[PDB]
């Protein structure tokens, strides 16, 4: 029990620190940036495979 409660406390602390960002409003910026940056690696790998 004293292990589960401590795990919960740590998870809550991390959740608070992280949510302090979505409060800042950077979640939309991150989503938009990752909507373009995510597939670059796969596209480059496919193009390089085609070249080779």
């Amino acid at each position: 029990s004293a292990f589960e409660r401590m795990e919960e406390k740590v998870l809550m602390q991390e959740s608070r620190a992280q949510a302090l960002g979505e409060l800042a409003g950077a979640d939309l910026e991150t989503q938009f940036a990752q909507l373009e940056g995510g597939s670059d690696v796969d596209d480059e790998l496919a193009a390089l495979k085609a070249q080779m």
């Binding site: 809550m12 959740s15 608070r16 992280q18 949510a19 302090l20 979505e22 409060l23």
Partner: protein, 55 residues
């Protein structure tokens, strides 16, 4: 008791004018802003707690 109230009101007026002489708008106008922001900080932390609970 109808006289000590009057005496204390006179003393309070003396002290309040002695203070209102010292207030200087240039510095007070900035201390007020400082304290307003310092309280906005705590409000932000509260909203953070709420969003963490939702998460």
């Amino acid at each position: 008791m109808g006289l000590f109230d009057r005496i204390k009101r006179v003393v309070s007026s003396n002290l309040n004018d002695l203070v209102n002489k010292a207030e200087d708008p240039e510095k007070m106008l900035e201390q007020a802003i400082l304290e307003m922001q310092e309280d906005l900080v705590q409000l932000r932390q509260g909203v953070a707690q709420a969003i963490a609970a939702q998460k």
